[PDB]
Design a protein around this ligand. Sequence first.
Ligand SMILES: O=C(O)C1=C[C@H](O)[C@@H](O)[C@@H](O[C@@H]2[C@H](O)[C@@H](O)[C@H](O)O[C@@H]2C(=O)O)O1
Ligand SMILES: [Ca+2]
Ligand SMILES: [Ca+2]
Length: 126
Amino acid sequence: DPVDYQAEDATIVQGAVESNHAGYTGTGFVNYDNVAGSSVEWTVTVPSAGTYDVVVRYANGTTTSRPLDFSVNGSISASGVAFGSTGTWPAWTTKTVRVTLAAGVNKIKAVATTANGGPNVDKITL
Ligand SMILES: O=C(O)C1=C[C@H](O)[C@@H](O)[C@@H](O[C@@H]2[C@H](O)[C@@H](O)[C@H](O)O[C@@H]2C(=O)O)O1
Ligand SMILES: [Ca+2]
Ligand SMILES: [Ca+2]
């Protein structure tokens, strides 16, 4: 079965664990710093090699899409994945990103590519 990997439990670069908007799961969420290069990197375990539907649960209380690049350590997995508006910060939704993984432990990194940083990210599920 898919497992929830909480953002606030992952490796956060230029970001903060926060909990001041309603509707996150786990103990909070990650607010990426509003800077290019802000990132979160999750450590996941999957039973078989192949391409997974990585469900990214996020919010973006602005009218400006906030794109992320996904990689599995070192290697580009998805490039310029746009995270559009959700109207308000507590209004979480999801986006599925295809990421190819090996059997066992993998690290998935999502890095902000624009000066606005990333959307707020609650977790990934896969
Ligand atoms: O990414 C944002 O633009 C953002 C994340 C927060 O969830 C929002 O409440 C809002 O926060 C602003 C700053 O990003 C944040 O670092 C500061 O501590 O508070 C700001 C605010 O407007 O409250 O935007
Ligand atoms: Ca931010
Ligand atoms: Ca969370």
